[PDB]
Design a protein around this ligand. Structure first.
Ligand SMILES: C[C@](COC(=O)NCCN)([C@@H](Nc1c(C=O)cc2ccccn12)C(=O)O)S(=O)O
Length: 244
């Protein structure tokens, strides 16, 4: 079959072609595999950006700050994108990366409860600072790609410290693709308020046989770069390895 050298070269070429620097961590059982064109990013800390939504939702639901069918009403003020100027549930806001909805959720949770829950979960450096509505966007909260793939592994297998119903609700919110009997659950992320800008795509693959293969793509986003580049490189890498 295909050599490890060829797989590594192919995935590295996906990041090279996009003219960026990035890594993608794959986890099978307890083993971590690092691929990409800048392997040292694996243990470097970056803001989680939208990937934090997964945990924001978990906390919000567990602590009764919202329900899965509650509709967060658009307040009528201009948003960064027209697509965000509407009423939506947590799940809809997850799919649209609707930051305003999640900022409202964070405000309901409150700084004190948020700091305690982020600590309880041991997410990244666990520090949210003093601003409850933007700590995952501009710091001080940071996390490495290894910690992100492990967070995905824990959520996929319901190991996080939340009722299993809560975990299942948030997981249902993350289905972004189906391919050849395989289901891909993930959350993209783009930290535009930091320099350099970081891009993320963290989730897992649920294969027909029921096995789950967690992953975390992390790269530098550059001016005039497409968010869908995080997805194409992720899908191409997963396919090259025979995961999907
Ligand atoms: C790039 C995504 C979504 O991805 C899409 O390209 N849009 C898609 C919906 N079809 C999204 N970024 C994001 C955040 C999450 O990090 C957080 C902010 C804050 C301000 C401005 C943009 N902010 C975006 O600006 O649209 S990020 O991957 O969540």
């Amino acid at each position: 079959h295909i050599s490890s050298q060829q797989h590594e070269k192919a995935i590295k070429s996906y990041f090279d072609e996009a003219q960026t620097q990035g890594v993608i961590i794959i986890k099978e059982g307890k083993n971590l595999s690092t691929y990409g064109n800048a392997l040292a990013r694996a243990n470097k800390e970056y803001v989680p950006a939208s990937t934090f939504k997964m945990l924001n939702a978990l906390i919000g639901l567990e602590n009764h700050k919202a329900t899965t069918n509650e509709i967060f009403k658009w307040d009528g003020k201009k948003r960064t994108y027209p697509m965000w100027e509407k009423d939506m549930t947590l799940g809809e806001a997850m799919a649209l990366s609707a930051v305003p909805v999640y900022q409202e959720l964070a405000r309901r949770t409150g700084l004190e409860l948020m700091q305690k829950e982020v600590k309880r979960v041991n997410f990244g450096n666990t520090n949210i600072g003093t601003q409850v509505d933007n700590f995952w966007l501009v710091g001080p909260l940071k996390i490495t790609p290894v910690q992100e793939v492990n967070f995905a592994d824990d959520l996929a297998h319901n190991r996080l410290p939340f009722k299993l119903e809560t975990q299942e609700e948030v997981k249902k919110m993350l289905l972004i693709k189906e391919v050849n009997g395989s289901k891909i659950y993930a959350k993209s992320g783009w930290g535009m308020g930091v320099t350099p800008q970081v891009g993320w795509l963290t989730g897992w693959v649920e294969q027909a046989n029921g096995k789950k293969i967690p992953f975390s793509l992390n790269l530098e986003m550059k001016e005039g770069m497409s968010g869908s580049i995080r997805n194409e490189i992720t899908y191409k890498s997963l396919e090259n390895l025979g995961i999907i």
